[PDB]
Amino acid sequence: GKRQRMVMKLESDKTFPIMLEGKINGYACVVGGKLFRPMHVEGKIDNDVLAALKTKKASKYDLEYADVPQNMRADTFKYTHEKPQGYYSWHHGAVQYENGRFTVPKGVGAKGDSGRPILDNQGRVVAIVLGGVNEGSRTALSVVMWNEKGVTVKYTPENCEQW
Amino acid sequence: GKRQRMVMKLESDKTFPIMLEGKINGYACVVGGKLFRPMHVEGKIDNDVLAALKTKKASKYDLEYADVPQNMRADTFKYTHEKPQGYYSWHHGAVQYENGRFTVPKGVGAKGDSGRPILDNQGRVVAIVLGGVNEGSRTALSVVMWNEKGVTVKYTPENCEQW
Amino acid sequence: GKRQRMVMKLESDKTFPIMLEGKINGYACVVGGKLFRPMHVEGKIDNDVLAALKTKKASKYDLEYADVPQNMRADTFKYTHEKPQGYYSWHHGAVQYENGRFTVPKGVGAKGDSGRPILDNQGRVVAIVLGGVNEGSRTALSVVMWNEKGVTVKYTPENCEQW
Amino acid sequence: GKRQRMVMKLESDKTFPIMLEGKINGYACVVGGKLFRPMHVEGKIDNDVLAALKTKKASKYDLEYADVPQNMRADTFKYTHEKPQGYYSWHHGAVQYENGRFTVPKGVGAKGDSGRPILDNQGRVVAIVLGGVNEGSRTALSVVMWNEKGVTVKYTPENCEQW
């Protein structure tokens, strides 16, 4: 109920969709002065400022990143590495964090909702949704996250389908 | 009144539009395990399953056809060859079948409504609208239909304009 | 207030926005039987009648221009050479005319604001906005206009922005 | 409707239809003491005295001028050259005169209503309608008229059809 409204209020201005002949196939992320955007989602950036840049690539970590200018670094997402197990907020409701794995209940999940960040009860991004795999009743996510040392860890289960 | 509501209830899930940079220019048809789609309507299929296939072509009969998989063959249109003369249901109201010819009263008919199937009082597809020609007050249709033997007959009046 | 509403009634009929991939970049004006389009604005005019017409270019005055078809010639704007000082109308409120300089109170005027015809106290076009600069607490504009002889005159302040 | 009563009551005495097989093709006008009749209109004058004349041809201006007998020189239209902008009183209502061009709202104007005079608010002929073209929502007219020098001037828009 109110969780989706809080997601729409937090991700209103900072989330920009990716257009491809009128089709919405992905979402970029503006956090820490960096613009995260995946490889398989191909299209034009809806924002005029973020589209006229050059994104350095990382095909192993499946991420394109760029440098957000200084006049927009205050209006970004927050990020942290301290995260316990339990529940977190996602755009379609809740997501479970168990044994270092993000799980989403079934019914939701198609092609197009790639790049949506995972939020917490305070308002900090803990993961970035990149893919998903159907596991019985409860699907698992293939995402990226950080740690205490500062190494971007990409978690990928078996036989995932890119969204 | 209720005829357009019955057309919208029957053609809700089985009719998929064709997109071309946000413009709706045609409609495919899923009937008999086959995906009918014309030549002159060019664009991407809005459905994700039907777009990732290969359609065999027939330029003389003006039809591209493909094989719908077995998990969707039950959710198709119905088709028959037994047709009398008189009235039939169409998306913009009624259509007259006289002397083996489909006629539509004027006022309706533009570029974009190509591929809409013609239904009957029971719910079976009897023809597929491909083109139209303005004849006095009452326009004629250039369509395809079947017969008792099983030969796809394409009926085309003189000086038609493709929609 | 009141002034903007009759301007909206005029712009709904004859001022046509351009179609960039998701947004509006500029506005084509149809005045006196001659379609006008700015150069730095790139896209497609919404009418399929006004899209097919090939435009001649005038790089000194920053405007493509083409010939209007004969049916559309009565449904055009009107143009006036004589402009006294005071207040004129515009889509975003009012515009001051002082010492031959169309100036606008600030906060309005950004990207996607190009080709909007400045109207008068009768409904005739006296200028066409191409951009402007923020002159302190009040922004001035860079318009083309007309004089008594029939000579298209462009005025542009220092370091204007192509909107 | 009050101006059309004035036009009909002035045309009841001084306007003569040119009938071919009973069908109206045009109107002879007796203005200023000389008979006027267009070229392309075929038939004979309804008045018996005017039909037995030798009309001198003038093929450029689409007119066939004649002379009026002395007993009929007082029963003629008066005319003028003076024409400010605004409205004038045609046979079917009003006619706009802007930028040196007579325009009628559309629909009216077919084969037959040629040679009709255009009156002013005083009761003087300022133009003689020959033909016109439909510029969409308003029809420009091809007329002959006079000027301050005393010279017959014909105005002709593009692609005018002879009425």
XYZ file of C-alpha atoms in Angstrom:
652
model
C 0.000 0.000 0.000
C 2.093 2.881 1.304
C 5.375 1.132 0.429
C 4.795 1.589 -3.311
C 3.914 5.236 -2.632
C 7.200 5.690 -0.751
C 9.065 4.060 -3.656
C 7.328 6.426 -6.099
C 8.173 9.418 -3.888
C 11.845 8.458 -3.503
C 12.409 7.311 -7.107
C 10.459 10.157 -8.766
C 13.166 12.512 -10.054
C 16.270 10.310 -9.728
C 15.009 7.386 -11.855
C 15.073 7.851 -15.630
C 13.686 5.206 -18.021
C 15.393 3.940 -21.167
C 13.393 4.383 -24.370
C 13.658 2.174 -27.466
C 11.141 3.240 -30.163
C 8.631 4.064 -27.428
C 9.241 0.927 -25.340
C 10.451 1.089 -21.736
C 13.022 -1.686 -21.318
C 15.213 -0.533 -18.430
C 15.983 2.027 -15.748
C 19.272 3.725 -14.939
C 20.432 4.691 -11.455
C 22.002 7.959 -10.288
C 23.895 7.305 -7.046
C 27.188 8.580 -5.617
C 27.791 10.794 -8.627
C 27.654 7.685 -10.833
C 25.196 6.596 -13.537
C 24.651 2.832 -13.490
C 23.131 1.330 -16.652
C 23.242 -2.297 -17.868
C 24.561 -3.775 -21.105
C 21.581 -5.744 -22.432
C 19.185 -2.790 -22.087
C 19.857 -0.788 -25.258
C 18.254 2.551 -26.021
C 18.345 6.294 -25.520
C 18.385 8.027 -22.132
C 15.202 10.027 -21.516
C 17.180 12.677 -19.629
C 18.954 15.191 -21.852
C 21.925 15.740 -19.527
C 22.733 12.062 -18.897
C 22.436 11.098 -22.578
C 25.237 13.404 -23.809
C 28.041 11.684 -21.896
C 30.444 8.768 -22.311
C 29.965 5.660 -20.173
C 32.915 3.445 -19.289
C 32.039 -0.229 -19.659
C 32.483 -3.343 -17.530
C 31.168 -6.457 -19.273
C 32.143 -8.875 -16.491
C 30.252 -6.906 -13.827
C 27.549 -6.016 -16.424
C 27.671 -2.276 -15.691
C 28.192 0.974 -17.558
C 29.216 3.868 -15.328
C 29.775 7.585 -15.852
C 30.495 10.792 -13.937
C 27.510 12.879 -12.827
C 28.430 16.612 -12.707
C 28.732 18.498 -9.430
C 25.419 20.388 -9.821
C 23.474 17.100 -9.494
C 25.526 15.085 -6.947
C 23.352 16.253 -4.036
C 20.177 14.957 -5.738
C 21.282 11.305 -5.898
C 20.390 8.115 -4.056
C 22.066 7.029 -0.839
C 24.176 3.894 -0.520
C 25.499 1.734 2.306
C 27.093 -1.645 2.980
C 25.666 -2.497 6.424
C 22.691 -4.780 5.776
C 21.046 -7.418 8.003
C 18.836 -10.290 6.868
C 15.070 -9.986 6.608
C 12.803 -7.710 4.563
C 13.464 -4.807 2.198
C 11.364 -2.500 0.028
C 11.072 -3.008 -3.732
C 8.992 -1.270 -6.410
C 6.503 -4.139 -6.545
C 6.287 -4.496 -2.772
C 8.715 -6.469 -0.610
C 11.872 -8.516 -1.164
C 13.462 -11.036 1.194
C 17.189 -11.061 1.996
C 18.066 -14.547 3.256
C 21.538 -16.180 3.342
C 22.941 -13.339 1.250
C 20.318 -13.920 -1.450
C 17.484 -11.707 -2.684
C 14.193 -13.539 -3.258
C 10.935 -12.206 -4.727
C 7.562 -14.020 -4.571
C 6.086 -15.038 -7.913
C 3.406 -13.327 -9.985
C 5.611 -10.338 -10.815
C 8.642 -10.243 -13.108
C 8.789 -9.705 -16.871
C 11.034 -8.106 -19.504
C 11.522 -4.408 -18.803
C 11.925 -4.000 -15.036
C 15.738 -4.148 -15.068
C 17.780 -1.613 -13.110
C 15.339 -0.888 -10.279
C 17.313 -0.322 -7.048
C 16.405 -2.087 -3.812
C 15.669 0.248 -0.895
C 15.532 -0.225 2.873
C 13.448 1.184 5.735
C 15.704 4.274 5.934
C 16.068 5.130 2.238
C 19.417 3.700 1.102
C 20.119 1.585 -1.980
C 21.440 -1.853 -1.037
C 21.288 -3.663 -4.414
C 20.497 -3.116 -8.102
C 18.159 -5.587 -9.811
C 19.692 -6.974 -13.008
C 18.166 -10.415 -13.568
C 15.952 -13.125 -12.117
C 15.531 -16.888 -12.093
C 12.369 -18.844 -11.269
C 12.962 -21.146 -8.286
C 9.926 -23.225 -7.353
C 7.474 -20.750 -5.889
C 9.920 -17.979 -4.950
C 12.213 -16.470 -7.571
C 15.813 -15.439 -6.913
C 17.567 -12.292 -8.122
C 20.905 -11.826 -9.895
C 22.089 -8.463 -8.568
C 25.148 -6.426 -7.586
C 26.066 -5.094 -4.160
C 28.973 -3.687 -2.158
C 30.857 -4.725 0.986
C 32.899 -3.247 3.825
C 36.175 -3.386 1.876
C 34.754 -1.633 -1.188
C 34.564 -4.392 -3.805
C 31.502 -4.559 -6.072
C 30.264 -8.151 -5.774
C 27.971 -9.498 -8.505
C 25.714 -12.312 -7.286
C 24.307 -14.566 -10.006
C 22.353 -17.808 -9.463
C 22.199 -20.678 -11.921
C 20.416 -20.356 -15.302
C 19.172 -16.788 -14.930
C 17.182 -14.937 -17.593
C 18.112 -11.322 -18.288
C 15.275 -8.814 -17.949
C -23.982 -0.456 -28.764
C -23.464 -3.928 -27.322
C -21.924 -5.242 -30.562
C -18.754 -3.187 -30.065
C -18.631 -4.423 -26.459
C -18.855 -8.029 -27.678
C -16.064 -7.333 -30.187
C -13.921 -5.853 -27.393
C -14.653 -8.860 -25.162
C -13.832 -11.424 -27.866
C -10.798 -9.611 -29.323
C -9.284 -8.554 -25.968
C -6.417 -11.007 -25.428
C -6.125 -12.573 -28.900
C -5.612 -9.320 -30.853
C -2.153 -7.741 -30.684
C -1.377 -4.383 -32.348
C 1.669 -3.610 -34.476
C 3.813 -0.728 -33.226
C 5.977 1.527 -35.410
C 7.658 4.285 -33.334
C 4.526 4.513 -31.186
C 2.031 4.393 -34.074
C -0.597 1.657 -34.375
C -0.763 0.700 -38.056
C -2.090 -2.866 -38.058
C -3.388 -5.857 -36.134
C -2.314 -9.484 -36.346
C -4.622 -12.472 -35.945
C -4.078 -15.645 -33.908
C -6.358 -18.373 -35.278
C -5.946 -22.120 -35.823
C -2.439 -22.077 -34.402
C -1.471 -19.558 -37.098
C -0.386 -15.909 -36.894
C -1.734 -13.891 -39.822
C -0.006 -10.553 -40.479
C 0.046 -8.480 -43.696
C 2.962 -7.274 -45.810
C 2.384 -3.515 -46.013
C 2.002 -3.138 -42.233
C 5.612 -2.977 -41.036
C 6.623 -2.831 -37.395
C 7.310 -4.764 -34.220
C 4.870 -7.184 -32.587
C 3.668 -5.927 -29.199
C 3.563 -9.492 -27.863
C 6.929 -10.851 -26.752
C 6.220 -14.475 -27.705
C 4.918 -13.803 -31.229
C 7.736 -11.376 -32.089
C 10.577 -13.906 -31.636
C 9.503 -16.224 -34.458
C 9.957 -16.588 -38.215
C 7.003 -15.915 -40.508
C 6.742 -17.630 -43.883
C 5.654 -15.195 -46.584
C 3.063 -15.218 -49.361
C 3.166 -12.028 -51.427
C 0.416 -13.072 -53.854
C -2.078 -13.776 -51.056
C -0.609 -10.846 -49.029
C -0.115 -12.912 -45.862
C 2.664 -13.809 -43.456
C 1.959 -16.918 -41.399
C 3.714 -18.699 -38.543
C 3.254 -21.559 -36.080
C 1.723 -20.730 -32.694
C 3.064 -23.102 -29.978
C 0.869 -25.734 -28.356
C 0.462 -23.844 -25.044
C -1.538 -21.101 -26.827
C -3.545 -23.024 -29.477
C -6.600 -23.287 -27.204
C -6.731 -19.489 -26.753
C -7.221 -18.671 -30.450
C -10.105 -17.506 -32.616
C -12.574 -19.869 -34.246
C -12.938 -20.273 -37.999
C -15.516 -21.714 -40.382
C -16.463 -21.791 -44.059
C -20.275 -22.007 -43.865
C -21.502 -18.433 -44.380
C -24.891 -17.132 -45.590
C -25.599 -13.659 -46.956
C -26.756 -10.801 -44.757
C -25.196 -9.068 -41.745
C -22.029 -9.682 -39.732
C -20.287 -8.032 -36.785
C -17.265 -5.767 -37.264
C -15.234 -3.641 -34.840
C -16.924 -0.442 -36.008
C -20.408 -1.952 -36.004
C -21.920 -3.991 -38.834
C -20.795 -5.237 -42.247
C -22.962 -6.501 -45.100
C -22.211 -9.713 -47.012
C -23.982 -9.482 -50.375
C -23.173 -11.459 -53.566
C -19.972 -12.741 -51.976
C -18.809 -9.185 -51.254
C -18.200 -7.390 -47.959
C -19.517 -3.816 -47.846
C -19.120 -1.203 -45.096
C -21.104 2.070 -44.886
C -19.058 5.250 -45.164
C -17.801 7.553 -42.420
C -15.347 4.985 -41.056
C -12.130 3.753 -42.664
C -8.630 5.229 -42.477
C -4.990 4.108 -42.412
C -4.336 1.799 -39.472
C -7.349 -0.509 -39.137
C -5.871 -3.330 -41.242
C -6.046 -6.928 -40.036
C -9.263 -6.758 -38.006
C -11.147 -10.068 -38.376
C -14.842 -10.183 -39.246
C -16.998 -12.045 -36.720
C -20.479 -13.562 -36.857
C -23.384 -13.976 -34.427
C -21.778 -17.122 -32.949
C -18.161 -15.979 -32.597
C -16.273 -17.356 -35.613
C -13.921 -15.482 -37.943
C -15.227 -15.458 -41.513
C -12.862 -12.922 -43.154
C -9.792 -10.770 -42.467
C -9.934 -7.096 -43.452
C -6.944 -6.113 -45.598
C -8.053 -3.194 -47.775
C -10.973 -1.043 -48.864
C -12.251 0.896 -51.855
C -14.778 3.746 -51.843
C -17.818 2.846 -53.962
C -20.426 5.600 -54.113
C -21.944 5.685 -50.654
C -21.002 2.172 -49.509
C -17.376 1.046 -49.545
C -16.243 -2.455 -50.496
C -13.587 -4.564 -48.782
C -10.599 -6.445 -50.207
C -10.316 -9.443 -47.880
C -9.384 -13.126 -47.676
C -11.638 -16.060 -46.848
C -11.834 -19.849 -47.041
C -14.143 -22.355 -48.741
C -15.394 -25.923 -48.391
C -12.451 -27.410 -50.308
C -9.821 -25.603 -48.234
C -8.412 -22.997 -50.626
C -7.679 -19.499 -49.299
C -9.466 -17.149 -51.709
C -8.370 -13.500 -51.810
C -11.136 -11.156 -52.978
C -9.965 -7.794 -54.314
C -12.148 -5.169 -56.041
C -10.894 -2.621 -58.540
C -8.545 0.233 -57.514
C -8.323 -0.541 -53.804
C -6.235 1.460 -51.332
C -4.215 -0.473 -48.762
C -4.892 0.436 -45.134
C -5.623 34.998 -16.034
C -7.492 35.759 -19.262
C -4.929 36.664 -21.949
C -3.365 33.196 -22.221
C -6.658 31.373 -22.910
C -7.444 32.939 -26.304
C -3.792 32.336 -27.196
C -4.307 28.663 -26.341
C -7.431 28.716 -28.527
C -5.334 30.076 -31.401
C -2.348 27.742 -30.847
C -4.603 24.667 -30.731
C -5.438 25.190 -34.418
C -2.345 26.571 -36.168
C 0.751 26.242 -33.938
C 2.094 22.714 -34.317
C 4.684 21.154 -31.989
C 7.520 19.075 -33.334
C 7.943 15.413 -32.393
C 11.272 14.441 -30.965
C 11.379 10.771 -29.850
C 9.656 11.362 -26.526
C 9.292 15.119 -26.061
C 8.586 18.423 -27.803
C 11.594 20.360 -29.101
C 9.929 23.224 -30.971
C 6.836 24.660 -32.592
C 6.112 25.191 -36.272
C 4.115 28.326 -37.073
C 1.836 28.713 -40.097
C 1.561 32.435 -40.849
C 0.414 34.120 -44.055
C 0.647 30.921 -46.053
C 4.283 30.128 -45.277
C 5.270 27.407 -42.791
C 8.140 28.377 -40.478
C 10.464 26.038 -38.566
C 13.629 26.798 -36.570
C 16.870 25.084 -37.509
C 18.357 23.863 -34.221
C 15.023 22.196 -33.467
C 15.078 18.751 -35.098
C 12.147 16.347 -35.360
C 8.929 15.852 -37.302
C 5.916 18.135 -37.673
C 2.768 16.477 -36.308
C 0.694 16.869 -39.486
C 1.336 14.406 -42.294
C 0.460 17.240 -44.683
C 3.079 19.561 -43.180
C 5.658 16.776 -42.843
C 6.063 15.944 -46.536
C 6.807 19.522 -47.621
C 10.486 20.172 -48.313
C 11.733 23.361 -46.671
C 14.086 26.030 -47.949
C 16.685 27.269 -45.480
C 17.852 30.746 -44.447
C 20.882 30.366 -42.171
C 21.204 34.089 -41.437
C 17.737 34.106 -39.862
C 17.828 30.568 -38.391
C 14.589 29.395 -40.013
C 13.569 26.722 -42.452
C 10.566 27.826 -44.463
C 8.315 26.114 -46.990
C 5.178 26.856 -48.989
C 1.751 26.191 -47.467
C -0.800 24.199 -49.532
C -3.729 26.073 -50.997
C -6.443 24.704 -48.692
C -4.500 25.746 -45.589
C -3.938 29.344 -46.802
C -7.070 30.837 -45.229
C -6.392 29.128 -41.877
C -3.108 30.907 -41.171
C -1.983 33.548 -38.722
C -1.679 37.213 -39.579
C 1.421 39.374 -39.327
C 1.898 43.028 -38.443
C 4.754 45.405 -39.158
C 3.655 48.118 -36.714
C 4.337 47.471 -33.034
C 4.085 50.211 -30.386
C 5.663 49.926 -26.954
C 3.876 48.210 -24.111
C 2.578 44.706 -23.503
C 2.115 41.815 -25.914
C 0.955 38.264 -25.378
C 2.729 34.911 -25.357
C 1.962 31.319 -24.386
C 3.781 31.712 -21.057
C 1.978 34.839 -19.882
C 2.947 38.322 -21.053
C 5.940 39.868 -22.814
C 7.176 43.459 -22.578
C 8.210 45.402 -25.674
C 10.572 48.267 -24.846
C 13.133 50.042 -27.087
C 12.797 47.226 -29.615
C 13.438 44.356 -27.214
C 10.965 41.604 -26.326
C 11.684 40.858 -22.674
C 10.049 38.374 -20.298
C 10.110 38.147 -16.465
C 12.404 35.328 -15.507
C 11.770 31.784 -14.374
C 10.203 30.812 -17.706
C 11.809 30.014 -21.046
C 13.889 26.854 -21.388
C 14.555 24.009 -23.813
C 11.575 23.143 -25.979
C 10.524 26.809 -26.241
C 11.146 27.693 -29.884
C 8.906 28.960 -32.644
C 6.168 30.187 -30.315
C 4.536 33.169 -32.056
C 4.305 36.334 -29.978
C 0.784 37.632 -30.551
C -0.654 41.119 -30.033
C -3.760 42.824 -28.619
C -5.724 41.679 -31.703
C -4.490 38.170 -32.512
C -1.765 38.832 -35.067
C 1.812 37.583 -34.903
C 4.494 40.223 -34.403
C 7.509 38.010 -33.595
C 8.742 34.414 -33.386
C 10.801 33.343 -30.376
C 14.087 31.558 -31.063
C 15.773 31.879 -27.671
C 17.084 34.325 -25.151
C 19.462 35.196 -22.343
C 18.894 35.956 -18.653
C 19.496 39.709 -18.331
C 19.652 39.775 -14.555
C 16.191 39.615 -12.989
C 14.379 39.634 -16.359
C 15.143 37.683 -19.521
C 15.245 39.146 -23.022
C 14.484 37.235 -26.207
C 16.061 36.672 -29.625
C 13.235 36.962 -32.131
C 12.731 37.470 -35.825
C 10.151 40.041 -36.863
C 9.054 42.267 -39.728
C 9.169 45.945 -40.598
C 7.325 48.483 -42.747
C 9.228 47.684 -45.949
C 8.676 43.931 -45.819
C 12.118 42.909 -44.547
C 12.530 40.089 -42.035
C 14.588 41.510 -39.162
C 16.311 39.335 -36.570
C 17.381 40.804 -33.240
C 19.671 38.886 -30.920
C 21.184 40.000 -27.592
C 24.612 39.047 -26.288
C 25.310 35.322 -25.774
C 21.789 34.014 -26.255
C 20.855 30.368 -25.825
C 19.264 28.394 -28.653
C 16.216 27.104 -26.781
C -30.312 39.110 -43.486
C -31.008 42.826 -43.795
C -28.126 43.445 -46.218
C -29.270 40.556 -48.430
C -32.687 42.204 -48.759
C -30.914 45.338 -50.024
C -28.898 43.279 -52.511
C -31.997 41.454 -53.789
C -33.987 44.688 -54.092
C -31.157 46.278 -56.074
C -30.715 43.174 -58.264
C -34.455 42.909 -58.991
C -34.233 45.776 -61.507
C -30.633 45.858 -62.724
C -29.479 42.209 -62.943
C -30.410 39.864 -65.791
C -29.795 36.091 -65.858
C -28.078 34.481 -68.832
C -30.237 31.433 -69.533
C -29.170 28.454 -71.645
C -31.975 25.867 -71.972
C -33.591 27.606 -69.003
C -30.596 26.915 -66.750
C -28.867 29.896 -65.154
C -25.224 30.274 -66.190
C -24.465 33.892 -65.386
C -25.695 37.414 -64.850
C -25.385 40.505 -66.997
C -24.805 43.622 -64.905
C -25.771 47.156 -65.925
C -23.385 49.378 -63.966
C -22.496 53.003 -64.695
C -24.200 53.147 -68.079
C -22.545 50.170 -69.798
C -23.627 46.547 -70.078
C -21.232 43.920 -68.723
C -21.243 40.202 -69.453
C -18.523 37.564 -68.962
C -17.005 35.529 -71.787
C -17.351 31.905 -70.701
C -21.031 32.159 -69.729
C -23.146 30.759 -72.565
C -26.750 31.735 -73.235
C -28.770 34.856 -73.958
C -29.789 37.873 -71.902
C -33.233 37.676 -70.286
C -34.038 41.268 -71.266
C -35.122 41.601 -74.891
C -33.569 45.028 -75.480
C -30.185 43.987 -74.089
C -30.137 40.721 -76.043
C -30.315 42.552 -79.397
C -26.962 44.304 -79.065
C -23.435 44.089 -80.474
C -21.258 43.429 -77.426
C -17.644 44.333 -78.144
C -15.345 41.605 -76.881
C -12.445 42.049 -74.464
C -10.882 38.622 -74.044
C -8.220 39.490 -71.460
C -10.476 40.732 -68.663
C -13.148 38.008 -69.213
C -15.759 40.647 -70.078
C -17.980 41.616 -73.004
C -18.719 45.317 -72.598
C -21.540 47.100 -74.400
C -23.315 50.443 -74.288
C -26.672 51.367 -72.752
C -29.371 53.409 -74.556
C -30.057 56.902 -73.267
C -33.503 56.085 -71.856
C -31.877 53.433 -69.621
C -28.775 55.340 -68.437
C -30.499 56.401 -65.209
C -31.603 52.845 -64.320
C -28.042 51.617 -63.780
C -25.927 50.684 -60.805
C -23.821 53.417 -59.367
C -20.251 52.438 -58.594
C -17.090 53.629 -56.904
C -13.419 52.840 -56.485
C -13.193 53.578 -52.762
C -12.689 50.367 -50.787
C -11.451 50.337 -47.189
C -11.012 47.025 -45.431
C -13.919 45.275 -43.774
C -17.156 43.736 -45.027
C -19.155 44.089 -48.225
C -22.574 42.829 -49.200
C -22.726 40.012 -51.763
C -25.819 38.228 -53.075
C -25.398 35.405 -50.558
C -24.775 37.526 -47.490
C -21.432 39.123 -46.689
C -17.952 39.054 -48.209
C -14.675 39.950 -46.496
C -12.250 42.318 -48.214
C -8.781 41.971 -46.703
C -5.374 42.704 -48.297
C -7.009 43.481 -51.635
C -8.929 40.221 -51.987
C -12.620 39.377 -51.710
C -13.242 36.231 -49.662
C -16.545 34.445 -49.023
C -17.056 31.718 -46.378
C -17.110 28.355 -48.046
C -19.804 26.120 -49.492
C -21.391 28.727 -51.745
C -20.028 29.330 -55.237
C -20.792 26.907 -58.060
C -21.440 26.946 -61.799
C -23.827 29.798 -62.500
C -23.370 32.575 -59.940
C -20.881 34.580 -62.011
C -21.351 38.184 -63.038
C -23.013 39.043 -59.735
C -21.986 42.463 -58.389
C -20.565 43.116 -54.941
C -22.174 46.089 -53.196
C -21.070 48.341 -50.350
C -22.945 49.812 -47.375
C -24.098 52.737 -49.559
C -25.367 50.814 -52.583
C -22.536 51.053 -55.106
C -20.819 48.268 -57.035
C -17.161 47.749 -56.160
C -16.499 44.442 -57.966
C -17.984 41.969 -60.430
C -17.562 38.298 -59.527
C -16.125 36.117 -62.292
C -14.783 33.045 -60.502
C -12.940 31.773 -57.462
C -11.026 28.977 -55.783
C -11.744 27.249 -52.459
C -8.854 27.831 -50.054
C -10.135 25.363 -47.494
C -12.417 27.106 -45.011
C -12.800 30.243 -47.159
C -13.064 30.933 -50.892
C -11.037 33.683 -52.552
C -12.665 35.388 -55.527
C -11.491 36.465 -58.980
C -13.167 39.786 -59.761
C -12.715 42.857 -61.905
C -12.826 46.282 -60.276
C -11.647 49.873 -60.604
C -9.203 52.175 -58.852
C -8.570 55.843 -58.131
C -6.779 56.430 -61.451
C -9.812 55.251 -63.427
C -8.321 51.976 -64.656
C -10.137 48.648 -64.790
C -8.135 46.123 -62.749
C -8.732 42.367 -62.658
C -7.514 40.352 -59.676
C -7.033 36.628 -60.112
C -5.916 34.152 -57.438
C -4.173 30.884 -58.261
C -6.090 28.030 -59.936
C -9.429 29.828 -60.127
C -12.354 27.966 -61.659
C -14.635 29.878 -64.007
C -18.131 29.954 -62.506
